[PDB]
Each structure stands twice: as C-alpha cells, then as structure tokens.
Amino acid sequence: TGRPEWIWLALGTALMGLGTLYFLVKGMGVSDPDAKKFYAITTLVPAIAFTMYLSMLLGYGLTMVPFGGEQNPIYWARYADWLFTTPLLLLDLALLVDADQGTILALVGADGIMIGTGLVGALTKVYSYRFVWWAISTAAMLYILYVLFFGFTSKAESMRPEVASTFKVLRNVTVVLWSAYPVVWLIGSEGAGIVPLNIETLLFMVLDVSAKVGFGLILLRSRAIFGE
Amino acid sequence: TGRPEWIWLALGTALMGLGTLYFLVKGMGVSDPDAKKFYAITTLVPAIAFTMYLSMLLGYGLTMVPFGGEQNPIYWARYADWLFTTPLLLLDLALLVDADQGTILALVGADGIMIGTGLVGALTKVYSYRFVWWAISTAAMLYILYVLFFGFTSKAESMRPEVASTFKVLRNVTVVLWSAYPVVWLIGSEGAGIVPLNIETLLFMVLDVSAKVGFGLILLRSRAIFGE
Amino acid sequence: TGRPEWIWLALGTALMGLGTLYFLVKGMGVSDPDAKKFYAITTLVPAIAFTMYLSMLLGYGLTMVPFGGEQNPIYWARYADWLFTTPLLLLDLALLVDADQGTILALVGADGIMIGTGLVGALTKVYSYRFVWWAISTAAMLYILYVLFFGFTSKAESMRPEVASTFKVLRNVTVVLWSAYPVVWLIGSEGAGIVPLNIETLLFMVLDVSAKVGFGLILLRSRAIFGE
Ligand SMILES: *C\C=C(C)/C=C/C=C(C)/C=C/C1=C(C)CCCC1(C)C
Ligand SMILES: *C\C=C(C)/C=C/C=C(C)/C=C/C1=C(C)CCCC1(C)C
C-alpha cells in the first residue's frame, strides 16, 4: 500500500529536488536566447517531478483502485507527473532538431494520448480492459519513437554535427528509457502483478530520475544548445 | 443508464478508429511544412475521440449525477473529448485563414469556456442552475461563430480563392454542426429530458463523427492546405 | 460553510461579469494586431473568473476537506480560476516587454507549480503538510516575481519609454497583489484559521477583482499596447 515503498518515494523526492537546484544555479550563467529555452525546459521537468514525488510520499498523490477483486493502491500522481514532463522532453528534442510545428503538435498529441490512456488503464476496475488501454498507450509511444527516428534523426543530420550527434545520443537514450516504462507497468502490480508495488515504485523512481535529471545532465552539458 | 446505448458507443468507437487510421496512412504521402500541420491537427482529433468513445463504451467515461430527484448517468468523457478536439478544429480554420495570434487565443479561450461550462451544467445537481450554465456555454459558442463570420471570413477573402472558398464551406459546416450540440443537450436527458439517453447518445455520435471524420475528409481532400 | 460568504461570491460574480462586458465592447474599436492580443488576453481573464465565481456562488466550485479533525469547506474553483488567469496576466507582462520564449515557459511553468501546489495544500488532510505546500508554492511565486524584476524590468527599459513605464507600474501592481495572496491563505481558514472563511472569501474577492478587472483597466487604458 503506502508504507513499504516510502524510501523510494523519499529518495525520488530528494533526487528531483537536488536536481532542480543544480539546474537553477547552472542556468544563471546563461543569456543566449536559445540556451535559455533548453534551460527553462530542462529545469522545469524535475521541478514538477519534485512536487509530484513529494505528493506521493506524503500520501496525497495516491488512490485505491478496485480490480481483480482487490483494493490496489494507484499512485495517480506518477501519471500526473508524466503528463507534464514527457511533452517537455519531446520539446528539447524538437528544439534540438528544429522540428516544424506540425511535427511538434503530432508528438505532443500522441504523448498526451499515451499518458492519458495509461492513466485510464491504471484506474480501470475491470481487469481485462486494463490491458486494452496499456496497448493503445503503447502504440502511441511507438508512434512517438517512430517519429524521433523517421522524422527527426533524418533532419538533425541536416544540421550542425554537434547537434546531430547530441540528438543522436539523446534519441538513443529516449528509446531505451521510454520503452522501459510499459514493460514495468506490465510486470508490476498495476498490470500483471508479477512484482510487488514495492519494486514497481523503485523501478519507476530509477527510470524517472534518469529521464528527469540524467537526461538533463547530458543535454545541458552539451554545446548543442548554443547557436555559436 | 449504460446498456441501451452501447451500440452507438461501439459504432462511434469503430468509426473514430477507422477514421484515425485512414488519416495516418494518407498523411504519409505528405512533406509540405504547412500541409503537415493540417494533417497533424486533423488526424489527432479522431485519435482522441477514439480513446474517449472507447472509454464510454467500456464504462470508464461515465458517472451518475443526482438531479430532479433522480440518478442520471452522465458521460463526462463526451465533454472531455470536446475539450481537446474543438480547439483543434478552430485551429484548422485559423491556419486556413492565417488568423492573428490575438484572435486565436480569443477563440480557444471562449471554446474552453463553452465546454467547461457545458460540463459544469452536465454535472450540476440543482435542476434550474443546469440551464444557467447551458446559457453561458451557448453564448460562448455564438461568440466563436461570430468571430468565424466577422473576423475570419472577411480575411479568407483577402487570401487565395481556393482557401477562401474551402474556408467558406468549412465555416458553413461549423455553424450547422456546432449549433446542433446545444439543441441536442437541451432536448436530451442531461437537459429537458424530452428524449431518452439512448437517442441522445446516438445524436451526439452522429454529430461527433461528422465533425471529427467528416469535416476532416473535406479539409484534407482540399488543395487549400498546400502553399502552391 | 457555504452560506455566510455568499454576498462576496455574488458581488464577485457581478463585478467579473460587468468587467468582461466592458472589455468586450471596448475591444471592438480595435484592429491593431498587437492591440488585439492585449485585449484578447485581458478580456478572457475576467470571462473565466466570472464562470468560476458563479460556480462558487451556486455551490458547484466547493468541496469539504477533513483536517484538524474538522470538516472544512474548500472553494477549489478559486484555485481553478487562478490556474488559468495568472498565466494570462504573466503573458500581458511578457508581450509588454517582448520577453523571449525561454523566459515565458519558465514563468508559466513556475506559475502552474505555484497554483498546483497551493491547491494540493488546500485539499491536504494532514495539518502540518498543508504548510509544506504553502511554502513550495510561495517559493515559485518569489521565483516569478524575481524574474519580473531581474529578467523583465531590465529589458522593458531597452524598449519604448511608454512601455517601460507602463510595465514598471504593472510590475509594481503585481508585486503587491500577488504577494497578498499567500498572506491571506496563511491567516485564513485554509491555513492558520486566524480569520473566518467569511472574511477569507471577501479578501480574495477584493484581490481577484483588483487583478482581473483593475489591472485590466490600467493596461487597456495605456498606449503601451499599440505599436505606433
Ligand atoms: C518522466 C519522464 C518520462 C520519459 C516518462 C515516460 C513514461 C512513459 C513512456 C510511460 C509509458 C506507458 C506506456 C507506453 C503504456 C503503459 C502505461 C505507461 C503510462 C507506463
Ligand atoms: C467534437 C467536435 C465538435 C465540433 C464538438 C462540438 C461541441 C459543441 C459545440 C458543444 C456545445 C454545447 C453548448 C453550446 C451548450 C450546452 C452544452 C454543450 C457542451 C453540448
């Protein structure tokens, strides 16, 4: 329920907090118009996650969901966090490659669908339906990753080499991390219940910090953010 | 309640699904910057409606509301769908006529008001208050339609003839379809109860498919989306 | 609960309504691209507040929250109103000073955090935690005000004198009004309970009208909105 995994919630909260502070301070030594944006976007991600992880720790971002004839504790704040941060991660990749607005809306819309349906499946009472949503959500994610490889990478190459290369790595990071989420939900308590809520929370905290601080450390330590 | 109108919910879900797939495939043969946007926007509308109609079918996008001394089943997901799609429909008309940002915000804000207040009235427990919201919502809609005729049409004429003409028809379609919604809510169970929830659901499914697939078919089969 | 402060709710609703109508009519005599935006943005703020104050009056935007071993009535619609209007107020200041997009996102993100966490603390059941949220929210507000003085004012001076001066006053107004909110929440029933819900509602209605109509009257009666 809400006791065993508090340590992961607390570690997550601390890591997001420290991460947000490191980016704030680091962003002071910046005045380049375009550099700001990457900093503004990359510092906001963990600021939000910080409040979301804190809300789960204190017990506000949690709710019980009845299914499989049981009362399962669902951390809805985990999805609320994802609803606002993933589209911002997509934006960094978008600015990085100079993506057209038409492409930006497509990704954001698919991203909102991905999270929105994942949340619906998290809260769904009927067992089998739960996986229908996990399937729709998963498709949106592949759609997103399909664009990042067949509508982004091809363009980054048409840009400065430092940008194409940084983007290439950030894209690669994204494929690995994002794809890891649906797998965790499927083996966890929200889905198949092959692993307890305790290890499910830990796994997502590891993934969230990696994507919300780790990914930030890579992008923000790159010259790909300045126009030279 | 949630049994009689399932056929309309299922037909709606299927029609939105097939519609989304047709636009995805059709959008592959497109690379024009501005063409993308119309495709990105027009394909996302039914993608979302699809998930919303599926959520109503499975019973997740439904809730019971007490009023008139009765327990009335309210499909809140129907409004959730509208909250995200109507502003996107407005965007197609906006891009189509090259509308200024000031005008775009006005329409979107009024649109969010229109749906937001319609939802409040859908969920309202006190009978008479329900119609106060229907009235505020309806005013926002006329405001929107007033701009599409006295702040849009006049400009489309100052653009390419194919655009002005396509916009003219799309505007005309919008007046007829949008205005049809408040009328349906008033005679339906959510409002006057002059017609059962069964026919209310059917009527809105017909309208939603028309606006989410039909309207798309018209816009996307037009040269008004390319810059020549 | 929901009876004593209805007069403030009704006065608030009326003032926001009349305010919205005054701006609509006033905005008709405007065609300047940039003038529209200030009008579009400044007229939408009270349009929304109007619906929010009306929802509190009728009793829809209210909910009871258990804490301190008591059932406290929380006007969640007050925060819902703030969630959409404050970012729009920030936009007026942003357009006014020609702020970069990177700076705009930072402010909006911090603003959404400020309100989001204030709402969490409003709804929080555990007494001490409530103030943790008030503290996080308050920090975001100072962050916002810190940017309006060390990332905005310095630029407005690099613009036309009428803009710099109007912005200077609008900034000054913002510092005074915004800072007044957290103080009210702390002494009110949602926080310390040093003053009844009756006076808490009155105080916020006074502040809301000032920021949603008052501030509008100042900005819209200024030439700082036209490009000359
Ligand atoms: C906070 C940062 C990131 C990158 C979060 C990413 C989350 C996902 C990619 C989540 C995906 C899901 C899928 C595809 C289907 C099951 C439900 C999830 C919401 C966990
Ligand atoms: C999904 C596509 C469209 C075009 C949906 C449009 C919906 C409306 C115009 C709804 C309007 C309403 C009004 C004006 C007042 C009563 C409540 C409604 C939300 C049904």
Ligand SMILES: *C\C=C(C)/C=C/C=C(C)/C=C/C1=C(C)CCCC1(C)C
């Ligand atoms: C409607 C217009 C305005 C300017 C509203 C402003 C509201 C605030 C600045 C609210 C701030 C809060 C803080 C900083 C912390 C306690 C909770 C509040 C949400 C009241």
